[PDB]
Design an enzyme around this catalytic site. Structure first.
Site, mmCIF file in Angstrom:
data_model
loop_
_atom_site.group_PDB
_atom_site.id
_atom_site.type_symbol
_atom_site.label_atom_id
_atom_site.label_comp_id
_atom_site.label_asym_id
_atom_site.label_seq_id
_atom_site.Cartn_x
_atom_site.Cartn_y
_atom_site.Cartn_z
ATOM 1 N N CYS A 170 67.847 99.129 43.685
ATOM 2 C CA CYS A 170 66.778 98.479 42.948
ATOM 3 C C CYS A 170 65.574 98.249 43.858
ATOM 4 C CB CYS A 170 67.267 97.154 42.349
ATOM 5 S SG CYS A 170 68.094 96.068 43.526
ATOM 6 N N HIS B 201 65.276 87.920 46.664
ATOM 7 C CA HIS B 201 66.105 88.600 45.730
ATOM 8 C C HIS B 201 67.033 87.628 44.990
ATOM 9 C CE1 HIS B 201 68.870 91.440 44.103
ATOM 10 N NE2 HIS B 201 68.382 92.466 44.778
#
Ligand code: NAD
Ligand code: NAD
Ligand code: NAD
Lengths: 334, 335, 335, 335
Positions: free
Chosen positions: B154, B181
């Site tokens: 990602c 994150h």
């Protein structure tokens, strides 16, 4: 011996008192008054019980109008206008202004009109302030003619000790900071009106970018860095403890191992106490109740050519609060 | 129409399926198989209901050994081994490995033995796979010969598009990354055993530094940036959505407004749809369910001399899942 | 002096160890072995630092295959089959079974096979176990012959001391419980497969209802309330500390003051140490690291007619962990 | 068609405005004005984006003295004295009073002087209000001559529909509620001064007991239950959605099965729309953005002798905002 008053008995107000006692009263002062919005029972209660920092080690109680902490008796006032406060009668040497509402020398001077000798703003000051201090770095500059100084911000207090040794022993062309910061009480629970459209958003569910003068402000605690640092903050969903993440251009070539070593012996020497050093595999909560201004984290150093990235952890409440005591003393005996 | 399946039906799995249906099935594709091992009542319920992405706007049910999603019959399976799944019986052009446990190339070609003509991995693969792709950046380097590829991480999917037009029009001597994150399911609720000592600490109560290869792996999609980017992650207590924060030394002189202009242009150009451009005062949750791989944030740009800081937001689950579909197309239709 | 091994060195395992040292080793035992999934280095790290309970007050080091706490040498094992495991070599008197996977006499007897003489399950066991114990209430039922017992749940240890003194002095016809319980490591961070469809949902974003046997079980430890109590749990987004909310029909007329006076008397007398009493305006986090099994909250008491509502706070980790030590001492020295 | 003005555009105000539009403007009214002291741009932005409820699915913008939503232009005013507001010039039939500081008929009547015909308080009212309404329960009591009414509270709007069928068909002697409630902006992030010492504690890390008059207030709308119900709230770390947990002594014997049939029947007829009925294994966030006043949960029902426990979920923001629209209509059309 110095006589102190706290204006704003909130996260920073109380934790300065708690740090005064948890230290063992080493600081040659006495806390004699305390101003907030509520009755003495309220302040007594929030002194004894805390989410972020647990229960207060010693004994707390109330005596009509007086908060009593380990025998010491402390008057509790509830007047929102600082001008009409009895600082003269109490003969206060230093008012710690920790409400967040009187950050300029104009507004903070109400404490001089009230009759206190000096005032420490628990935050960045207005341009008109007498001085801006990061204890352990520029507290030398203080003179007896300073009446309304600033103690900088928690971030600035964390950044200054990180950058000084690296600028001295390597050199920095330019630097950019992101601080990832625990949420504070100027933020909100669920989205509601705020002067800043991002701080208007739920602090518990998002990363909220936010402005901060911390990077630039270092410029005028270490004048040699003036205009060489900028940055901003990201508020995240944690109750306490922040980190500074600094990227900078090294004047010359270097390595991770060397960067770490500079910072290591800086922490073991001239900046001892103020600057911590870490090699262990720890996370943010492990620095809760660490009284360092800045605990540099060797495990996260990264160097790519002339580009260096360094990080330091800071308890934005506890670190800053212990320094409020240090800087109160320094200011009283200039 | 490319006939497609999925192996592993977790967060990436289900959200790839949901991605497809939510888009309008506008991908030349049809999802014909799903191979978790938990039972079908349970997977239907987790398709229908989701904390982070909300209720699925569609009809979900189970008819015996099958899944029904807006009318269409999805064959459920249960084989641990990829070499003996029916795939080629049912004409499977592309398979998606989203359990992770089977990430490397030789384990991955087992789906080809089972009948699949290709395979996409939903993670960084071992240094031995036909490609690592970041759709919209380097997917044109695909061919008919390629079988078992990687769709990256990602984070790499957010970093690549961020960095390209900056390297291309300004030039990048070196960069370091911190991605802030959202927590993921390999982390823990309250401190307990983990093979990483930081990830063994409560995800809900700390900022947790973690290693990620995503900055180095930009080399594999943009060769001209081999060895020029490094970094790591700080895990924070959000359920979803993440930010890439990039500091780099620019080869020439520049401004914030120029960096921004270059990115706006690139969002309206080659990388349109893949790379977004934000000037609004938004917070992470505003990018939840945004299908971009990378949405650059012009409000956060800082340039100080030759040091430049830029950042891009990414829904670590949703963007990636929409790229997997894009990738599965471009995989099949290459020569 | 009795030699103890902890099997499953997680929330209850470590906190039972921590409990044992923070109480100045007053319990007449020695912890001679830990069994989990990592190496001593990992167990030492998690013993030393904790999110919920902060940094361990003593000293923790590593020496090879031995964890050393305050000078005591403790052997670290990592085998997930109790059958094997060198309890005979180490001469373990009592295994504390705290993994969550051996919650029946049948299953937990694998420790007997491995050399240990007696076991305590850190949870509700089957009906097959020799005794189910809430220390302070029924530990006197323990007998030399009993080899595998259950320590009950955190909730049962909180509810029995709450209910006992009120049923003795007032009388209880029937009662119904809700426990608003902190999340635990059997839950998930973001939606993902689980045997329980509600526990499959993010623990961090929801109130999640789940089953508990605690109400019925208060019948097993207090036979006079067999079949009279029932209830369930709601898991909420907190990392530790829970509350029991009990509603019951009184058998005669009572007042809120009488109910509180009764409980104050019980905390001061027969149940001193196991049951505390609060009248301060406190919140869940204030009961963190409170070793009581139950802290009655007089400020929350409600009576309307014959319907009484009473509440007790519990540190689901710390209370239960201190009780595991007490029960060990009772189990081995029984007769 | 009714001309509606919103005094005070905090969460209640905004959410009420959004529910109107998100329901497809099915209610026969138009929102012609908003009075708030914040600046328009901020209020526009907070209409378009929300963390708990997500992005408004339409278009929002500012144009001078006007907020614009899906083409409709809404006059924005900023005066703290509603006697001086142009309600009569604007033809406003109903002010929704959503500020907090005008909860008495005496105070609210300032709007009457400003030209509005009627006022509905989005909160429990003083003694002098013409009525208190839980829509679907007692809106029939509205009469032409009523000019200042209360819409009660979100908790009362959950509880009254829950308990009405049960009292009608089984009979309730007394009842005690705990409402497990999302935090609100009246709480704090980290411990700081509050007039209540428990709400002075971090909402994000604790279960926080608080008083509510919402159970006793059910007497206002169901006089047959006057004095029969009481209770309190426990604030937990979730951003939205709450559950009402009611314990009561039934007047005759019943079963869990009978209790549920009675609620299902109620949900499918008399209280259709206002009262929902769940048998699915769902968690709190699945009710986020559900416009029902009360969704009874069949899976949670317990009965033991004459003690009944019943639970109902409510979106403590969306439910209440939808009902404000319903009641506004009934108020303007009364007689
Ligand atoms: N919390 C941090 O991480 C941190 C760190 C460094 C500096 N600061 C600075 O310290 C200041 C206060 O921060 P805080 O977190 O303690 O805020 P806070 O809200 O927790 O505390 C402020 C206190 O002042 C009181 N107060 C408000 N108005 C008052 C008035 N007019 N008169 C007297 N008391 C009044 C409040 O009731 C409260 O108790 C701010 O300027 C902030 O920027 C905060
Ligand atoms: N979630 C993200 O932000 C994201 C983004 C990029 C890459 N990834 C990668 O994708 C992978 C999956 O992540 P996730 O968050 O979806 O995981 P997850 O834990 O949330 O879901 C995994 C699913 O796979 C199932 N599973 C486990 N073992 C299996 C087996 N032996 N056979 C069949 N099914 C099995 C589980 O039951 C579960 O339903 C990871 O390896 C991760 O690195 C995730
Ligand atoms: N957490 C609570 O509030 C609470 C309270 C009372 C009782 N309990 C019960 O105690 C038990 C433990 O709960 P927990 O919260 O400590 O769970 P946990 O997940 O934190 O602990 C389980 C530990 O066992 C280890 N483990 C897993 N399989 C193993 C194996 N076969 N051999 C050895 N170790 C293994 C794990 O690594 C972990 O350290 C459960 O049965 C639980 O129901 C929990």
């Amino acid at each position: 011996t110095i006589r102190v008053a706290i204006n704003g008995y909130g996260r920073i107000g109380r934790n300065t008192l708690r740090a005064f006692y948890e230290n063992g009263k080493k600081h040659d002062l006495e806390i004699v008054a305390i101003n907030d919005l509520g009755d003495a029972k309220t302040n007594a209660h929030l002194t004894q019980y805390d989410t972020a920092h647990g229960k207060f080690p010693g004994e707390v109680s109330v005596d009509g109008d007086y908060l009593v902490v380990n025998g010491d008796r402390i008057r509790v006032l509830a007047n929102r206008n600082p001008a009409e406060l009895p600082w003269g009668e109490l003969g206060v040497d230093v008012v710690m202004e920790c409400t967040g509402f009187f950050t300029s020398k104009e507004k903070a001077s109400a404490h001089l009109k009230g009759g206190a000798k000096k005032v420490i703003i628990s935050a960045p000051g207005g341009k008109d302030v007498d001085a801006t201090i990061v204890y352990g770095v520029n507290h030398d500059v203080l003179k007896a003619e300073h009446t309304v100084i600033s103690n900088a911000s928690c971030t600035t207090n964390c950044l200054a000790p990180l950058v000084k040794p690296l600028n001295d022993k390597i050199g920095l062309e330019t630097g950019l900071m992101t601080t990832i910061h625990a949420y504070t009480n100027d933020q909100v629970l669920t989205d509601v009106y705020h002067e800043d459209l991002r701080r208007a958003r739920s602090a518990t569910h998002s990363q909220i970018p936010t402005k901060t003068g911390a990077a630039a402000a270092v410029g005028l605690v270490l004048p040699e860095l003036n205009g060489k640092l900028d940055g901003y903050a990201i508020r995240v969903p944690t109750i306490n403890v922040s980190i500074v993440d600094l990227s900078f251009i090294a004047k010359r070539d270097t390595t991770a191992a060397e960067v770490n070593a500079i910072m290591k012996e800086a922490s073991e020497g001239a900046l001892k106490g103020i600057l911590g050093y870490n090699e262990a595999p720890l996370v943010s909560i492990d620095f809760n109740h660490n009284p360092a201004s800045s605990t540099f984290d060797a495990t996260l150093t990264k160097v790519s050519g002339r580009l260096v990235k360094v990080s330091s952890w800071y308890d934005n409440e506890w670190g800053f609060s212990n320094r409020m005591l240090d800087t109160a003393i320094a200011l009283a005996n200039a």
